[PDB]
Write a protein that binds this ligand. Structure first.
Ligand SMILES: N[C@@H](Cn1cc(Br)c(=O)n(Cc2ccsc2C(=O)O)c1=O)C(=O)O
Ligand SMILES: N[C@@H](Cn1cc(Br)c(=O)n(Cc2ccsc2C(=O)O)c1=O)C(=O)O
Ligand SMILES: [Cl-]
Lengths: 251, 251
């Protein structure tokens, strides 16, 4: 059984290779998740076929309980695995299984170097330095749902300054950080990737929340626990570190 | 079925309550893991009986493949769950199952405030500031097994300065940090706990490795995936944050 692996284009996890050489099938792609998948294939001993999710979505539910994206591909048995920056969440575990996480990440702060600002508390208690998140993303939604007082005050500031404080996308937010007195709230993984590529930029404070990326499978898949085992081996033998360093480290 | 829960005394996860009031059974204990267990019990709907692991060990293997500690209790079906600061590891997954992690942690650096030192690379390339780990602990073993060049150089320094660089326990290491020009390599969780209680002390840099604490069960336990689900709900609804803050925050 050649496993069908659903995935999604997302730098640096999954990209098309910058080549016009005759590359076919899996060889068309590169990235952290391609390297991970290769390692998993060699530990477990499976053949695989990478297929980009047709609708280009991660996977969310509508009011009728209908799913889309990579999650739908798993539910429909049109993919055996989902290998992507795919968050292990309560709602998704209702409908698919996940390996244990190959990466753990949390919301943090992207800001300039050389300022007395050291935490989210430092931003919360002032208004001179503006801060926000990508509109309608996971990070904005976190602040919107939070009952923690300091993040409620932070959401109050973001929501009241809606037009300016919230950006269209991560690229816009980084530009806002680079050009204006602005701090962007974004996933730690993304901050690490950006700060490696922008020496004027830095992470501020630690993680504001916590979640993991895991390999998705249909409910009951006999590959799930095997993939957990392989992930633990890669973790312990320093290979996940090596793969992260390969893709994250800047000039 | 009242579940037997194996655990281990370890501040602030599991402690005896500072009380001479008539407290029996589970009520004798307090701590992060007791709070977690209470939440799990209320989500899943189980009764439970907390029993300290008789040998006071986490769980390791001998040459005959014989286990001890909480892992042995699970293998022997003398406990249904292990709820403790118990690391999810490749070797343990061979013999027990684990929920997804309720806490994610990594080796980091404990040092004084106000120095130009900002990372492990800063320590590695000098000898004036001495650094090390607890002798024969997980953190020392990491550096001993690492193939990463900067941690090989760090291990070289720790091993050559064996007598002084390596400490007997965490308490000794903290005292060495407080009294000498010394940086201690220790788990991020422990650093957070200590820095909340010592205003002169701080964390240096980020995580050097990554691992998770999970709830242990016997292989095939029908509680494992339910506990994962409960953990995800607690994570997403900010309750794990609240429980960590309850036990970690200092004066
Ligand atoms: N992990 C998410 C999708 N995903 C993937 C990546 Br990579 C990522 O950086 N993010 C974060 C993100 C994307 C758009 S806004 C935003 C945010 O953190 O605010 C994400 O939500 C999921 O599983 O749905
Ligand atoms: N998690 C470990 C046991 N354990 C528990 C806690 Br709390 C802890 O801080 N550590 C770290 C530790 C303990 C003695 S030395 C050391 C270290 O990090 O070097 C640990 O190994 C296991 O599961 O065996
Ligand atoms: Cl699992």
């Amino acid at each position: 059984r050649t496993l069908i692996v659903t995935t999604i284009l997302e730098e640096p996890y999954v990209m098309y290779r910058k080549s016009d050489k005759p590359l076919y099938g899996n060889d068309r792609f590169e990235g952290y998740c391609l390297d991970l998948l290769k390692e998993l294939s060699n530990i477990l001993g499976f053949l695989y076929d990478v297929k980009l999710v047709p609708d280009g979505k991660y996977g969310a539910q509508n009011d009728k309980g209908e799913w889309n994206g990579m999650v739908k591909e798993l539910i429909d048995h049109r993919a055996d695995l989902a290998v992507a920056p795919l968050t292990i969440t309560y709602v998704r575990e209702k409908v698919i299984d996940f390996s244990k996480p190959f990466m753990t990440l949390g919301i943090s702060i992207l800001y300039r170097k050389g300022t007395p600002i050291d935490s989210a508390d430092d931003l919360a208690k002032q208004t001179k330095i503006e801060y926000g998140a990508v509109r309608d993303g996971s990070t904005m939604t976190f602040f919107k749902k939070s009952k923690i007082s300091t993040y409620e005050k932070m959401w109050a500031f973001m929501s009241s300054r809606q037009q300016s404080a919230l950006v269209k996308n991560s690229d816009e937010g980084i530009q806002r950080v680079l050009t204006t007195d602005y701090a962007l709230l974004m996933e730690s993984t993304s901050i690490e990737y950006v700060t490696q590529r922008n020496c004027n930029l830095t992470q501020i404070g630690g993680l504001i929340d916590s979640k993991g990326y895991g390999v998705g499978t249909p409910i009951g898949s006999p590959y799930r626990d095997k993939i957990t085992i392989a992930i633990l081996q890669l973790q312990e033998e320093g290979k996940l570190h090596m793969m992260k360093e390969k893709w994250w480290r800047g000039n």
